């Protein structure tokens, strides 16, 4: 007790003590930071929570933002694990603060977590996002918020005052402002705030980097397995109103005002029911409602900004898992299921390329096939398994991240890059998938420390070691111990040398080139090709 | 037959469809997201694919 | 003496005894096999030499076919070495026979050599083509002929009776017929005749394979560093008359009859003077007068025939040197000379691609650059040296040969493939060039055995070993000793497994894949691209 | 100056150009085949490139 009571600009809160092997932590869960975006407020940017009388109960996570529930594999941990765990509500804008015990004296550095989930799903309450071990082990303040997803967060009628778009990102910002204002109340230091996210979470982080109104809300950024310049991460204005209007028609609607008005009368579930129809189609790793390049939140396309931007005085941590593309293949690519080894024919391969690489000329797929085929072993199913897992991996993640990493480093920032290549012993996906998208998190958050879970000894160490890396970055903008020999040094990623480290149970190992040959195809050459195939219509 | 049952916004749950069939609604094209499961055989469409079955039991998985 | 006298269908000959370390050999040099293609016979297919009274002196090589003399590097062995050594004449259709001493009793297998020289140069009299060591060491009959080159051999006005084209190949055929008729006179067995050539020489061999009127003139084929389906090896009918007419205009000429009539009045040297003008331009590894796809000698394009052809009952030996493209780069590519290390800038590289890969869309060069660039080291001069040496190498040689090799094997033939990767210690080209085009020959012909030359001990063995390989193939259609353990086995090249051996001072080593990834670009993908870039005009 | 001298169909040979200049005729574009060398400075053309020199001696190499 004693310090479960805390007062913030808005009012009083009552927290809860979470138990860790190492010792206790103070958690404050479900703090209202916005006026619930309901009724007329649906699709509208968030308004700051008005102050309350009384003491708000913050001993438990508040409802998850209204989202689609992934049911592909009924009763399967690997998918169910990211499914909503609290009740589902539009009234969902609440955040959470973890802080050491006893509350630190001098202000300590703050980590802010933005979850991913393709911009259509996610929750701060997910078991794998428990902040208790990270805070206890590296004594820092941990904050995570819920932000609106799916249509409720990103449906946009560009230029509209009733549905501006990007409001899910706006939710993230409101919370970051809340942090400037209130984190000192927990021993948090608003002058040292680091952003870290995963996937869509990472792509968000990357957008706060590129949106000036947010630049003064944080000082450091960590992007894990994602980036704003990913092909799935942003949609154009033309495209966005196409999708919103499709959804409207699908739901019986009905002038942008009367369109959105009508839209606001429909039950939340009716909207989610029709979410997946509005997708341009024939694709894996694509989502209906994502951030728009409206000229507002982002003034140009993430790529355009990254190129012009000056980044001096910034430190960024970027990384990916070893097999990014693997699990997405079970959502379409012919011959792929989790319930066998997905040993595809040369013919399922050629068909999958069209899936894993949406709307792209015929000549373009040839070019992919040209690159990802081992011409010594063109028919080897196992080889064609990994190949398509790389096509999807590199196109959607490893090459957008590596581009970014190089553009930042080259333009003022100090960058550190990693490849996470260790498969959880508890992993519940098939072995062919290797180290899949999103399975470095449980380690970063030190979940292996939880004794009621079945991780190995070396692994419990691994997470510790890793948490140190993250903590050292947030404090200093440099992951490797302030001064530690004979420990291998994690050098900064640069545009030329291109150095990164491989996080696994072995000590740090330094590699050069983040899929450097593959990315030259995706980044340099492919766009020169599409430019031409398009002026061939 | 004991079949899976749920919606767009709910976890899958077992249910007694008993007499008659089960269905598995999904996105016809990639991503083939599962949109629901229950008792019967409902029409599909350009975007909606419905797979019907009767025998195997929890077959609409 | 004794057996330097020999009589052939045409008349009597007097040969000469050549000395070898191992012992003597009988040579018969400069045997007329055609009526000299002069005056009205210029550009016309060869007529069989009419029989003579008396005894023809065959103790010395007859004049080299009228050709251009390569003077790039005055006083430089490496180029001068392939220059004409006998006087230069149109009256040049003579052949040479080497035979063991004493003349074998029972009929022995015959090797026939067709020299290369881009179809614009060459001579059977070149020091490096001395047949004495091969005949002495493996007791077989060796025959080589001169064939017309440049315009005198290949200028074509398709459909013309006065200049049909392909007559240089016709010269080769006449000689092969001469061999059926007369080789028994030397202990030669007309029922066992193997063709072996190099470069254009190899490309010829490959055309006798595809020209039915020649199929009954030989039983085995060895193609070294060349192939009929090379981009430089054949020209179309439209193109050919373009070049012949350009040459005509250039020389003041003037109806195909009066065109060729006039053409026939010009001195030989006036014709050679203007040979290199008629080239479409901006290219290395391209030549003005080469075989035409006229529908006559070849009924379709070498590629078309190779694909349809049935090849059962055939044995072929195919190979290349380790660095095919290297020396050609000094004939244009910016930054390349033999007198330094040709460490090019990234910018000379990009410019060279346009040279080493003639008339090809912009998007196409990008695609080359995409493949041949190490994106870990895009500016490394040494790396860009080899890269462009491979671009030229693979495009012009290694991929046309490897395609052929795979198509043959797959369609009835038994194929054996090699990579020659040993640099002559006597080599006179710079070290950056490695093992360059045409420097396996001196070894095949066992020239290192010549004691007045400065080869090492291991090398003298190498040639011996190699000559055995060739001899074993000619006799049996299989290079490795009839029955020899524990000697590594040279397996047949097949379309799938793609096995080859690496001929060097080490024992046979078996590799899979003849530049398999590069060739998939050149053979599979590039043509799909050019198909599209062309329907973009 | 002692310079190189030859034609399309002959080996290169040294010669006394002495008073005045030397030339090196070649194919302007790749392949840049050398077409001749001798004394003087002769016109070139679209296809013919002529490089002139006087000082170095055997400079038309
Ligand atoms: C998406 C996919 O690949 N599903 C296929 C199914 O359509 C097919 O009937 C079966 C054939 O064995 O294999 C599985
Ligand atoms: C073909 C070629 O590369 N030749 C160039 C020459 O034109 C240039 O003046 C010089 C510059 O150093 O280098 C050499
Ligand atoms: C794996 O299972 C899926 C669904 O049952 C199917 O698409 C595929 O044929 C299977 N792969 C095999 C049997 O190799
Ligand atoms: C090599 O020599 C040639 C001709 O002198 C020239 O093109 C090139 O600049 C030289 N390379 C160097 C100096 O690196
Ligand atoms: Cl608990
Ligand atoms: Cl109060
Ligand atoms: Cl749960
Ligand atoms: Cl737009
Ligand atoms: Cl730029
Ligand atoms: Cl797309
Ligand atoms: Cl294919
Ligand atoms: Cl410690
Ligand atoms: Cl700092
Ligand atoms: Cl490495
Ligand atoms: Cl790579
Ligand atoms: Cl001699
Ligand atoms: Cl007589
Ligand atoms: Cl000589
Ligand atoms: Cl034609
Ligand atoms: Cl075919
Ligand atoms: Cl060409
Ligand atoms: Cl470039
Ligand atoms: Cl022996
Ligand atoms: Cl036989
Ligand atoms: Cl190998
Ligand atoms: Cl290769």
Short mmCIF file of C-alpha atoms in Angstrom, two decimals, chain A residues 81-402:
data_model
loop_
_atom_site.label_atom_id
_atom_site.label_comp_id
_atom_site.label_asym_id
_atom_site.label_seq_id
_atom_site.Cartn_x
_atom_site.Cartn_y
_atom_site.Cartn_z
CA UNK A 81 -2.87 -14.97 -27.88
CA UNK A 82 -3.33 -11.58 -29.59
CA UNK A 83 -7.11 -11.69 -29.34
CA UNK A 84 -9.01 -9.25 -27.07
CA UNK A 85 -8.94 -10.34 -23.41
CA UNK A 86 -11.03 -7.60 -21.85
CA UNK A 87 -14.56 -6.81 -22.96
CA UNK A 88 -14.95 -4.91 -26.22
CA UNK A 89 -16.03 -1.25 -26.25
CA UNK A 90 -15.79 2.02 -28.16
CA UNK A 91 -15.36 3.64 -24.76
CA UNK A 92 -11.80 2.35 -24.72
CA UNK A 93 -9.41 5.29 -24.49
CA UNK A 94 -7.54 4.45 -21.27
CA UNK A 95 -3.84 4.13 -20.47
CA UNK A 96 -1.63 2.34 -17.96
CA UNK A 97 1.39 3.28 -15.88
CA UNK A 98 3.88 0.91 -14.28
CA UNK A 99 6.43 2.31 -11.88
CA UNK A 100 9.11 0.89 -9.54
CA UNK A 101 8.56 0.20 -5.86
CA UNK A 102 9.21 2.28 -3.97
CA UNK A 103 8.38 5.12 -6.38
CA UNK A 104 11.73 6.50 -7.50
CA UNK A 105 12.88 9.80 -6.04
CA UNK A 106 14.87 11.59 -8.76
CA UNK A 107 12.95 11.49 -12.08
CA UNK A 108 13.55 8.26 -14.02
CA UNK A 109 13.33 7.62 -17.82
CA UNK A 110 9.99 6.65 -19.33
CA UNK A 111 9.23 3.93 -21.87
CA UNK A 112 6.00 4.21 -23.86
CA UNK A 113 4.61 1.14 -25.63
CA UNK A 114 2.48 1.30 -28.76
CA UNK A 115 1.06 -2.10 -29.67
CA UNK A 116 0.61 -3.35 -33.23
CA UNK A 117 -2.09 -5.46 -34.86
CA UNK A 118 -2.24 -4.26 -38.45
CA UNK A 119 -4.14 -1.13 -37.37
CA UNK A 120 -7.27 -3.29 -37.13
CA UNK A 121 -6.64 -4.93 -33.76
CA UNK A 122 -4.68 -4.72 -30.51
CA UNK A 123 -4.86 -4.01 -26.77
CA UNK A 124 -2.57 -2.71 -24.04
CA UNK A 125 -3.99 -5.43 -21.78
CA UNK A 126 -2.49 -8.39 -23.63
CA UNK A 127 -0.65 -10.80 -21.31
CA UNK A 128 2.49 -10.42 -23.39
CA UNK A 129 2.56 -6.65 -22.77
CA UNK A 130 2.70 -6.90 -18.96
CA UNK A 131 5.08 -4.13 -17.90
CA UNK A 132 5.88 -5.53 -14.48
CA UNK A 133 9.16 -7.34 -15.20
CA UNK A 134 10.65 -4.55 -17.30
CA UNK A 135 9.93 -1.90 -14.68
CA UNK A 136 11.14 -4.07 -11.79
CA UNK A 137 14.35 -5.17 -13.50
CA UNK A 138 15.48 -1.87 -15.04
CA UNK A 139 13.59 0.54 -12.77
CA UNK A 140 11.99 2.79 -15.37
CA UNK A 141 8.45 4.03 -15.85
CA UNK A 142 6.41 2.08 -18.38
CA UNK A 143 3.32 3.51 -20.05
CA UNK A 144 1.08 2.04 -22.71
CA UNK A 145 -2.20 3.29 -24.14
CA UNK A 146 -5.14 1.92 -26.09
CA UNK A 147 -5.81 3.60 -29.40
CA UNK A 148 -8.78 3.27 -31.73
CA UNK A 149 -8.36 0.72 -34.53
CA UNK A 150 -10.19 -0.44 -37.65
CA UNK A 151 -12.72 2.04 -39.01
CA UNK A 152 -13.21 3.59 -35.58
CA UNK A 153 -9.58 4.68 -35.73
CA UNK A 154 -8.76 5.13 -39.41
CA UNK A 155 -11.80 5.32 -41.68
CA UNK A 156 -11.19 8.59 -43.52
CA UNK A 157 -13.10 10.84 -45.88
CA UNK A 158 -10.09 13.11 -46.61
CA UNK A 159 -10.83 16.82 -46.23
CA UNK A 160 -13.81 15.92 -44.06
CA UNK A 161 -14.43 17.63 -40.74
CA UNK A 162 -16.66 14.75 -39.61
CA UNK A 163 -14.18 11.99 -40.48
CA UNK A 164 -10.66 13.44 -40.92
CA UNK A 165 -8.83 10.12 -40.59
CA UNK A 166 -5.69 9.35 -38.57
CA UNK A 167 -7.58 9.72 -35.29
CA UNK A 168 -6.08 6.50 -33.97
CA UNK A 169 -2.71 8.19 -34.19
CA UNK A 170 -4.32 11.22 -32.57
CA UNK A 171 -5.31 8.97 -29.68
CA UNK A 172 -1.66 8.02 -29.31
CA UNK A 173 -0.66 11.68 -29.25
CA UNK A 174 -3.22 12.73 -26.64
CA UNK A 175 -1.71 10.06 -24.41
CA UNK A 176 1.83 11.30 -25.06
CA UNK A 177 0.68 14.77 -24.05
CA UNK A 178 -0.94 13.22 -20.97
CA UNK A 179 2.52 11.85 -20.20
CA UNK A 180 4.30 15.19 -20.36
CA UNK A 181 1.67 16.47 -17.98
CA UNK A 182 1.36 13.61 -15.50
CA UNK A 183 4.34 11.25 -15.54
CA UNK A 184 6.24 13.15 -12.85
CA UNK A 185 3.44 12.01 -10.54
CA UNK A 186 4.96 8.54 -10.81
CA UNK A 187 8.66 9.38 -10.72
CA UNK A 188 8.72 9.73 -14.48
CA UNK A 189 10.97 12.18 -16.31
CA UNK A 190 9.11 13.94 -19.17
CA UNK A 191 12.44 15.12 -20.57
CA UNK A 192 13.50 11.53 -21.22
CA UNK A 193 10.68 9.69 -23.02
CA UNK A 194 11.35 6.78 -25.42
CA UNK A 195 8.81 5.36 -27.87
CA UNK A 196 8.83 1.65 -28.66
CA UNK A 197 6.36 -0.29 -30.79
CA UNK A 198 5.97 -3.43 -32.87
CA UNK A 199 4.62 -3.81 -36.41
CA UNK A 200 1.78 -1.25 -36.75
CA UNK A 201 3.02 -0.13 -33.35
CA UNK A 202 6.42 0.44 -34.92
CA UNK A 203 4.88 2.14 -37.95
CA UNK A 204 3.15 4.57 -35.59
CA UNK A 205 6.34 5.42 -33.74
CA UNK A 206 7.80 6.15 -37.15
CA UNK A 207 4.97 8.55 -37.92
CA UNK A 208 5.38 10.57 -34.73
CA UNK A 209 8.95 10.97 -35.95
CA UNK A 210 7.59 12.52 -39.13
CA UNK A 211 4.74 14.53 -37.65
CA UNK A 212 6.08 17.82 -36.18
CA UNK A 213 3.22 18.34 -33.68
CA UNK A 214 4.54 15.22 -31.98
CA UNK A 215 8.26 15.86 -32.11
CA UNK A 216 8.33 17.54 -28.73
CA UNK A 217 6.57 14.66 -27.02
CA UNK A 218 9.42 12.15 -26.97
CA UNK A 219 13.18 11.98 -27.42
CA UNK A 220 13.95 8.47 -28.66
CA UNK A 221 12.28 5.88 -30.90
CA UNK A 222 12.48 2.08 -31.17
CA UNK A 223 10.78 0.47 -34.19
CA UNK A 224 10.39 -3.32 -34.03
CA UNK A 225 9.38 -5.23 -37.18
CA UNK A 226 7.64 -2.27 -38.81
CA UNK A 227 7.99 1.18 -40.35
CA UNK A 228 5.80 4.05 -41.70
CA UNK A 229 7.11 3.51 -45.24
CA UNK A 230 5.87 -0.09 -45.39
CA UNK A 231 3.45 -0.69 -48.32
CA UNK A 232 0.73 -1.71 -45.87
CA UNK A 233 1.28 1.15 -43.43
CA UNK A 234 -0.24 4.09 -45.32
CA UNK A 235 -3.01 4.54 -47.87
CA UNK A 236 -3.65 7.43 -50.26
CA UNK A 237 -6.54 9.88 -50.05
CA UNK A 238 -8.21 8.60 -53.21
CA UNK A 239 -7.98 5.03 -51.96
CA UNK A 240 -9.18 5.89 -48.48
CA UNK A 241 -12.45 7.53 -49.49
CA UNK A 242 -12.97 4.65 -51.90
CA UNK A 243 -12.88 2.25 -48.96
CA UNK A 244 -14.97 4.40 -46.66
CA UNK A 245 -17.60 4.84 -49.35
CA UNK A 246 -17.61 1.13 -50.10
CA UNK A 247 -18.19 0.49 -46.40
CA UNK A 248 -20.94 3.12 -46.41
CA UNK A 249 -22.76 1.48 -49.34
CA UNK A 250 -22.28 -1.94 -47.72
CA UNK A 251 -23.98 -0.71 -44.57
CA UNK A 252 -26.82 1.14 -46.33
CA UNK A 253 -25.39 4.65 -46.44
CA UNK A 254 -26.95 6.72 -47.38
CA UNK A 255 -22.35 14.92 -49.18
CA UNK A 256 -19.76 13.69 -46.66
CA UNK A 257 -21.70 15.00 -43.70
CA UNK A 258 -24.90 12.98 -44.19
CA UNK A 259 -22.71 10.03 -45.14
CA UNK A 260 -20.84 10.07 -41.81
CA UNK A 261 -23.93 11.03 -39.87
CA UNK A 262 -25.68 7.88 -41.11
CA UNK A 263 -22.51 5.87 -40.55
CA UNK A 264 -22.57 6.98 -36.90
CA UNK A 265 -26.00 5.44 -36.30
CA UNK A 266 -24.89 1.87 -37.04
CA UNK A 267 -23.98 -0.57 -34.28
CA UNK A 268 -20.24 -1.03 -33.86
CA UNK A 269 -20.51 -4.70 -34.80
CA UNK A 270 -22.23 -3.94 -38.11
CA UNK A 271 -19.18 -1.87 -39.05
CA UNK A 272 -16.65 -4.56 -38.15
CA UNK A 273 -18.74 -7.13 -40.03
CA UNK A 274 -17.96 -5.36 -43.28
CA UNK A 275 -14.39 -4.30 -42.57
CA UNK A 276 -12.67 -6.87 -44.76
CA UNK A 277 -14.82 -6.36 -47.87
CA UNK A 278 -13.27 -3.01 -48.72
CA UNK A 279 -9.81 -4.41 -49.37
CA UNK A 280 -8.58 -4.08 -53.04
CA UNK A 281 -8.07 -7.86 -52.73
CA UNK A 282 -5.83 -10.77 -53.63
CA UNK A 283 -3.23 -10.04 -50.96
CA UNK A 284 -1.72 -11.09 -47.69
CA UNK A 285 -0.35 -8.45 -45.28
CA UNK A 286 -2.86 -5.75 -46.27
CA UNK A 287 -5.52 -4.05 -44.14
CA UNK A 288 -8.60 -1.94 -44.85
CA UNK A 289 -8.17 1.00 -42.50
CA UNK A 290 -4.71 2.40 -41.97
CA UNK A 291 -3.26 5.95 -41.67
CA UNK A 292 -3.83 8.32 -44.66
CA UNK A 293 -1.42 10.71 -46.28
CA UNK A 294 -3.89 13.58 -45.86
CA UNK A 295 -1.40 16.43 -45.77
CA UNK A 296 -2.43 17.04 -42.17
CA UNK A 297 -0.93 14.56 -39.68
CA UNK A 298 1.56 13.65 -42.38
CA UNK A 299 2.29 16.43 -44.85
CA UNK A 300 3.81 14.09 -47.42
CA UNK A 301 4.22 10.34 -47.83
CA UNK A 302 6.42 8.78 -45.16
CA UNK A 303 9.00 8.09 -47.87
CA UNK A 304 9.04 11.72 -48.98
CA UNK A 305 9.47 12.98 -45.42
CA UNK A 306 12.16 10.44 -44.53
CA UNK A 307 14.18 11.69 -47.47
CA UNK A 308 13.95 15.39 -46.71
CA UNK A 309 13.89 15.21 -42.91
CA UNK A 310 16.83 16.30 -40.81
CA UNK A 311 17.41 13.90 -37.93
CA UNK A 312 20.31 15.27 -35.92
CA UNK A 313 19.88 14.78 -32.18
CA UNK A 314 17.86 11.61 -32.57
CA UNK A 315 18.60 8.03 -31.54
CA UNK A 316 16.69 5.14 -33.02
CA UNK A 317 16.68 1.41 -32.35
CA UNK A 318 15.49 -0.71 -35.30
CA UNK A 319 15.08 -4.45 -35.75
CA UNK A 320 13.22 -7.45 -37.14
CA UNK A 321 12.76 -11.15 -36.39
CA UNK A 322 14.55 -13.79 -38.47
CA UNK A 323 11.48 -15.02 -40.36
CA UNK A 324 9.11 -12.07 -40.79
CA UNK A 325 6.96 -13.39 -43.62
CA UNK A 326 6.25 -16.91 -42.38
CA UNK A 327 2.94 -16.90 -40.49
CA UNK A 328 1.09 -14.58 -42.88
CA UNK A 329 1.22 -17.24 -45.58
CA UNK A 330 -1.47 -19.32 -43.87
CA UNK A 331 -3.99 -16.55 -44.58
CA UNK A 332 -4.12 -17.23 -48.30
CA UNK A 333 -1.02 -18.56 -50.09
CA UNK A 334 -1.97 -21.93 -51.66
CA UNK A 335 -0.59 -24.97 -49.89
CA UNK A 336 0.11 -23.20 -46.61
CA UNK A 337 -1.43 -24.29 -43.36
CA UNK A 338 -0.02 -24.49 -39.85
CA UNK A 339 -1.17 -28.10 -39.57
CA UNK A 340 1.46 -29.49 -41.93
CA UNK A 341 4.93 -28.54 -43.17
CA UNK A 342 3.56 -26.55 -46.09
CA UNK A 343 5.91 -28.17 -48.60
CA UNK A 344 4.64 -26.40 -51.70
CA UNK A 345 4.98 -27.38 -55.33
CA UNK A 346 6.85 -25.08 -57.71
CA UNK A 347 3.35 -24.21 -58.89
CA UNK A 348 1.91 -23.15 -55.55
CA UNK A 349 5.01 -21.00 -55.21
CA UNK A 350 4.41 -19.12 -58.45
CA UNK A 351 0.79 -18.61 -57.41
CA UNK A 352 1.74 -17.40 -53.93
CA UNK A 353 3.96 -14.65 -55.26
CA UNK A 354 0.83 -13.06 -56.68
CA UNK A 355 -0.70 -13.21 -53.20
CA UNK A 356 2.27 -12.05 -51.14
CA UNK A 357 2.88 -9.22 -53.59
CA UNK A 358 -0.51 -7.56 -54.33
CA UNK A 359 -1.45 -5.78 -57.59
CA UNK A 360 1.81 -5.88 -59.49
CA UNK A 361 2.36 -6.47 -63.22
CA UNK A 362 3.07 -9.92 -64.65
CA UNK A 363 6.61 -8.93 -65.59
CA UNK A 364 7.10 -7.92 -61.95
CA UNK A 365 6.34 -11.37 -60.52
CA UNK A 366 8.78 -12.89 -63.01
CA UNK A 367 11.37 -10.57 -61.53
CA UNK A 368 10.54 -11.72 -58.02
CA UNK A 369 10.59 -15.34 -59.06
CA UNK A 370 13.88 -14.65 -60.81
CA UNK A 371 15.43 -13.46 -57.56
CA UNK A 372 13.89 -15.82 -55.03
CA UNK A 373 14.41 -18.98 -57.03
CA UNK A 374 17.40 -21.20 -56.46
CA UNK A 375 18.03 -22.23 -60.06
CA UNK A 376 20.11 -25.12 -58.77
CA UNK A 377 16.99 -26.37 -56.97
CA UNK A 378 13.91 -24.78 -58.60
CA UNK A 379 11.46 -27.45 -57.40
CA UNK A 380 12.67 -28.10 -53.84
CA UNK A 381 9.51 -27.65 -51.72
CA UNK A 382 11.41 -26.78 -48.52
CA UNK A 383 13.40 -24.21 -50.46
CA UNK A 384 10.22 -22.75 -51.97
CA UNK A 385 8.72 -22.61 -48.47
CA UNK A 386 11.39 -20.24 -47.13
CA UNK A 387 11.54 -18.36 -50.43
CA UNK A 388 7.92 -17.15 -50.27
CA UNK A 389 8.31 -16.54 -46.57
CA UNK A 390 11.16 -14.20 -47.54
CA UNK A 391 9.29 -12.56 -50.40
CA UNK A 392 6.56 -11.54 -47.96
CA UNK A 393 9.07 -10.87 -45.19
CA UNK A 394 11.38 -8.62 -47.17
CA UNK A 395 8.69 -6.78 -49.14
CA UNK A 396 6.57 -5.82 -46.13
CA UNK A 397 9.12 -5.44 -43.34
CA UNK A 398 12.86 -6.03 -43.73
CA UNK A 399 13.28 -3.69 -46.69
CA UNK A 400 11.11 -0.81 -45.50
CA UNK A 401 12.94 -0.94 -42.14
CA UNK A 402 16.37 -1.23 -43.73
#
